Amino acid sequence: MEVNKKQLADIFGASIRTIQNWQEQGMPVLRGGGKGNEVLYDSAAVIKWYAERDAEIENEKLRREVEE
Template sequence: MGQKVNKRELAGILDVSERSLTEWQAQGMPIEVNAGRGSSNQYDTALVVTWMVERAKAGGAKESARDRLDRIRANREELAFAKDLEEVVVAADLIERFDAMITAAKVELLNTLPDNLASELSARYGVEVDDQLIREPIEAILRKMADYDPDDDALSDGDSDEPDDSEAAAEDRD
C-alpha cells in the first residue's frame, strides 16, 4: 500500500497536470476514495504507479483525437524549425538540385570537354585529334550510369580490391 494523496499532490509526484490525471481516471486509473463532485479524491500512489506500469506494458492508452492533433502540430512546428535552421532538406528539393547538377555535368562531358580536350591535344602534340575519340567513351560511361540499378546485386560496389571479370579470367588461365 502506498501513500494516500490528493489530486494536486499526485500531479506533483508524477510531474503531470491535474487535467492529465482527470483523463487517466476516465481511462481506468484507480481512485482510492472517490469523494464526489467538488470534493478532493484520494489516490493510493502504489496502485496508481502499478496501473501506469501495466498501461505502459500494454502500449498505453489509445491516443485521443486532441492529443493526436497536438502531436501532429508539434511535429510540424519542429520540422519547420529544423528547415529554418537548415538541419533538414525536403527530398523533392534535393532531387531537383541533384537532377540539375547531373544535367549540367552531362552537358559539360558531352559538349564542352571533347571539343576543348581535342583542341588542346591537337595544339600540344601537333596532331589532329578527332573529338569523337573522346566523346564515345564518355557516352558509353553515361549510358552505363543511366542503367544503374541500386537494387541490382550483380553490379560491383566499386571496390578496387575485387577483380573485375577480365582479371578473374586471366587468373583462371594461369
C-alpha cells in the same frame, strides 16, 4: 501512499489535468470522488496502473520543441 490529484500529478510530475483524465481512464484512485468529492489517489496503486499504460502521459511535457 494516498496523494490528492495535485500530489498525484506532482508525484508523477504530470498534469493534474492528466489526473483528471486518469480518473476517467480507470485509475485506482483512493476515494471515489464521485459525489461532489475530489477523489484521492493510491500513489502506489496509481502507478502500477499508470506504469502499465500511462507511461506515455509523461510525454505531455515532452511535446514542446524537443525535436518537432
